[PDB]
Design a protein around this ligand. Structure first.
Ligand SMILES: [Mg+2]
Ligand SMILES: [Mg+2]
Ligand SMILES: [Mg+2]
Ligand SMILES: [Mg+2]
Ligand SMILES: [Mg+2]
Ligand SMILES: [Mg+2]
Ligand SMILES: [Mg+2]
Ligand SMILES: [Mg+2]
Ligand SMILES: [Mg+2]
Ligand SMILES: [Mg+2]
Ligand SMILES: [Mg+2]
Ligand SMILES: [Mg+2]
Ligand SMILES: [Mg+2]
Ligand SMILES: [Mg+2]
Ligand SMILES: [Mg+2]
Ligand SMILES: [Mg+2]
Ligand SMILES: [Mg+2]
Ligand SMILES: [Mg+2]
Lengths: 150, 103, 56, 110, 117, 140
RNA sequence: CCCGGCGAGGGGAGUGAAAAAGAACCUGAAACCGUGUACGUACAAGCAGUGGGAGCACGCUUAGGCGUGUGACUGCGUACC
RNA sequence: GUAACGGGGCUAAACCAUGCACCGAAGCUGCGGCAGCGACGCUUAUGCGUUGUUGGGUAGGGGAGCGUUCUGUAAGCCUGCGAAGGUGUGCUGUGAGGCAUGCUGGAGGUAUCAGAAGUGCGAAUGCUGACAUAAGUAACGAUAAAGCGGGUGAAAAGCCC
């Protein structure tokens, strides 16, 4: 810490003592012990373990999430307002849900405190799929066998 | 008439007195089944016929009332050597009440 | 002359016994129906009966 | 407040003033002096002042002209003590706390 | 990243400091008491309740020895008479009969006196 | 219920009059010490406050068994250092049975407080019957 | 406005939702220091408690033998690291 | 200062022999309860009732947990018809602690399962701060001591004349 000095307290004598340096972990002055650090944190999951068990949604969350329709093609240039019209084709709104159309078109229109999220693309982790009530898979055909990637 | 018996300690000094005791077995709740004690009776001991035994003829027992068999009591009780301390402990029972009819 | 363990409480609270204060009790004297102080006649004029200090 | 007055600071230590206070309680009131005016200790001159101020509050906060009253309460508390230093044997034996109190006098009904 | 001991700090001291009795001086006012005294209490307690079962027995017999002997046969001979029986054995404790049912008790000393072969 | 007869704070006190003019001397102390506690007594749970009430008479008629008439350490040292220690043989002290000998019961009692309650509180004297400075009423 | 040395300090009145927010000012704990009340306590020896325990002050209940405080007397019994 | 029965006190309250009886520990038994393991009764992921047994413990090994600050679940839930915090109380758990609530309080808190720790103090002649103790004790700094009358002032031994 601001260790602007080495021990100036005279060891033997002066009555109770036994001081030393001043980045001294016991001295209220300063000095924070086993300090700390920036670190990495980021642990890395294997590749196979990454794809392992994801959309278990369909079967379990059956009566909830596993819908596939369309990416809403008729949506205006950049319009989120009347999203409700399309947010009602299933009656899934603030209930959360995310789309997986896979086209960075104008459907990235979903902007709100926290309801509908797009990310419609290969890039997507279960964490999100499980953060929403009914992840509208949609996309259509994109959901193939080994590449059911949305 | 006086009372007398053992069952988990000779607790039967008082006459009817309705004092705690032990516990049934399978469960406690109240009500009853009508359980006569046994002829531990001091002959009941109480009348012109206080008797050395208690044995003053066959069959002589009081019916158990089963007033209230619950509660506990809590007592810390913790030991500790010079390097340890089992200090942290607790063991209690409920001692069913029982009023007991007449001798 | 050092000491070693000393009990602030109780002890000392005992020596304080011989420390409480005390009460006077005196008169007023004929003229002053009050003051007179202690064994004095009166300070108002400092007179026991006349021209003593300042009076009539 | 059932007519009080109390104090704060000035400086006169606690026990010092707590001594003279014991002298006055119970009857009091009509004892605005004599049981106080005839005892000289600094603590005394201080309790009397506030004593009168208190008995004076008997014409403002409440009625009951000065003549009855009781003074059922008088207690001093330790008030923040000033700190200072004291040159001595090179600087070891020096603390000096001035100490101070109040009085808090009261006058209710018997 | 906050120990912020303050958070249980208080609760612990307060817990043991909760020695109603106050005991005396530092024994309540200062944390010093707890594991010093509140701990002793636990120790002195640990042994006394179980060691007590006998301290009363010592009294029970102390009075039986003082009651039964006045009317023939000492406590030493008493339980021996009593000892002989098919069902006749009701232990002591209630043995305090000498205080409320003297007639019973003296009628119980014969159950032993006349009993001693 | 909790069995233990209470402590009616020395409930009853049965008065008595020994003789001491006997021949048992030291032997007598026990049945004199047991008595002021809870000997003949049944109920009145001892250990706690209690006692009885008897009284000695002349007592001057004792000889003990062996040559004890001539022994018995007896000293009543005082807080005086300077080398004190007042040793006097039994016969030397038997000349005036005071707080001692007849008072052989003191060392036989629970000692300290409460036991101290019984202590000399039985009276001693040394002349039997004459002018019983003690309570004349009921005794056996 | 009132006590006071045209002090300090306070007591009212008023501001305020609150001044039990008054400038020492949020919440305000602990050590430590007091006033009041219930009980114990001035012939009794020691880690001060723990086990037993009467009495007393209040609280009990259509008694029913209890709750809270305090604890005379008594068996034990040399703190923690 | 008895001090070479613990004291008393003992002629047997000593010793030797003989036998019975009694006191006596957390030892054993009885009664209730807790936990581990083997079994028994069954039931049968499993589990519970009976039972046999095991449960002193420093270094140390192993195994389970509570609690705190922060993150997710959280503009969800709790709250000014009073949050956190402080203090009492009652119930509850084996314990770490848990909850409910009186009062204070004046604005926030966070079931749950999971995640990460500046993660839990009584000691280190530990560090900082506050308050005790001694104690209203020592001391008030050269032994060149001062007395009086006025003045002023709330008050003068000490200030002005
Ligand atoms: Mg250097
Ligand atoms: Mg030191
Ligand atoms: Mg720092
Ligand atoms: Mg990769
Ligand atoms: Mg005996
Ligand atoms: Mg003893
Ligand atoms: Mg504040
Ligand atoms: Mg007394
Ligand atoms: Mg007890
Ligand atoms: Mg036996
Ligand atoms: Mg035993
Ligand atoms: Mg173990
Ligand atoms: Mg917080
Ligand atoms: Mg430690
Ligand atoms: Mg002085
Ligand atoms: Mg001194
Ligand atoms: Mg001196
Ligand atoms: Mg000078």
């Amino acid at each position: 810490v601001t260790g602007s000095g080495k021990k100036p307290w005279r060891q033997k004598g002066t009555g109770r003592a036994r001081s030393g340096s001043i980045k001294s972990p016991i001295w209220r002055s300063g000095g924070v012990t086993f300090a700390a650090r920036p670190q990495d944190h980021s642990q890395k999951v294997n590749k196979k373990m990454y794809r392992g068990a994801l959309k278990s949604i369909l079967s379990e969350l059956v009566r909830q999430d596993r819908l596939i329709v369309v990416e809403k093609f008729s949506v205006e240039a950049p319009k989120t307002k009347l999203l409700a019209q399309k947010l009602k084709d299933m009656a899934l709104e603030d209930v959360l849900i995310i789309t997986g159309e896979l086209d960075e078109n104008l459907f990235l229109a979903a902007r709100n405190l926290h309801k509908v999220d797009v990310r419609d693309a290969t890039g997507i982790d279960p964490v999100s799929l499980i953060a929403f009530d009914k992840v509208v898979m949609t996309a259509d055909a994109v959901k193939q066998v080994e590449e059911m990637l949305a | 008439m006086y009372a007398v018996f053992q069952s988990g300690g000779k607790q039967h000094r008082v006459s009817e007195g309705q004092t705690v005791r032990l516990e049934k077995l399978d469960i406690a709740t109240g009500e009853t089944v009508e359980f006569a004690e046994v002829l531990m009776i001091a002959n009941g001991e109480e009348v012109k016929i206080g008797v050395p035994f208690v044995d003053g003829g066959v069959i002589k027992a009081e019916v158990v009332a089963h007033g209230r068999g619950e509660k506990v009591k809590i007592v810390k009780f913790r030991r500790r050597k010079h390097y340890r301390k089992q200090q942290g402990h607790r063991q209690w029972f409920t001692d069913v009440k029982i009023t007991g009819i007449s001798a | 002359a050092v000491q070693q363990n000393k009990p602030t409480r109780s002890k000392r609270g005992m020596r304080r016994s011989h420390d409480a204060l005390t009460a006077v009790t005196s008169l007023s004297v004929d003229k002053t129906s009050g003051e007179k102080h202690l064994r004095h006649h009166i300070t108002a004029d400092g007179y026991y009966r006349g021209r003593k200090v300042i009076a009539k | 407040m059932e007519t009080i007055a109390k104090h704060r600071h000035a400086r006169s230590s606690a026990q010092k003033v707590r001594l003279v206070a014991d002298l006055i309680r119970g009857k009091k009131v009509s004892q605005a002096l004599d049981i106080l005016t005839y005892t000289n200790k600094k603590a005394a001159v201080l309790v009397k002042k506030v004593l009168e101020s208190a008995i004076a509050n008997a014409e403002h906060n409440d009625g009951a002209d000065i003549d009855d009253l009781k003074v059922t309460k008088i207690f001093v508390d330790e008030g923040p003590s000033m700190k200072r230093i004291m040159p001595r044997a090179k600087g070891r034996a020096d603390r000096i706390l001035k100490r101070t109190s109040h009085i808090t006098v009261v006058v209710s009904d018997r | 990243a906050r120990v912020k001991r303050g958070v249980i700090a208080r609760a612990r001291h307060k817990k043991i400091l909760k020695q109603a009795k106050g005991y005396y001086g530092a024994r309540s006012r200062v944390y010093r008491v707890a594991f010093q005294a509140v701990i002793k209490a636990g120790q002195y307690a640990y042994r006394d309740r179980r060691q007590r079962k006998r301290q009363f027995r010592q009294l029970w017999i102390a009075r039986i020895n003082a009651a039964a002997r006045q009317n023939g046969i000492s406590y030493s001979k008493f339980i021996n008479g009593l000892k002989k029986a098919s069902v006749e054995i009701d232990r002591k404790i209630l043995a305090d009969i000498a205080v409320f049912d003297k007639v019973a008790f003296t009628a119980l000393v014969e159950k032993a006196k006349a009993a001693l072969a | 219920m909790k069995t233990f007869t209470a402590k009616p704070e020395t409930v009853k006190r049965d008065w008595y009059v020994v003789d001491a003019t006997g021949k048992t001397l030291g032997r007598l102390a026990t049945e004199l010490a047991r008595r002021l506690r809870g000997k003949h007594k049944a109920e009145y749970t001892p250990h706690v406050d209690t006692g009885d009430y008897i009284i000695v008479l002349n007592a001057d008629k004792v000889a003990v068994t062996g040559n004890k008439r001539t022994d018995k350490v007896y000293y009543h040292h005082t807080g005086h250092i300077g080398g004190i220690k007042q040793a006097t043989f039994e016969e030397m002290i038997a000349r005036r049975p005071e707080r001692v000998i007849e008072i052989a019961v003191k060392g036989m009692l629970p000692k300290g407080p409460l036991g101290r309650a019984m202590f000399r509180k039985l009276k001693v004297y040394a002349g039997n019957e004459h002018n019983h400075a003690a309570q004349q009423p009921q005794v056996l």
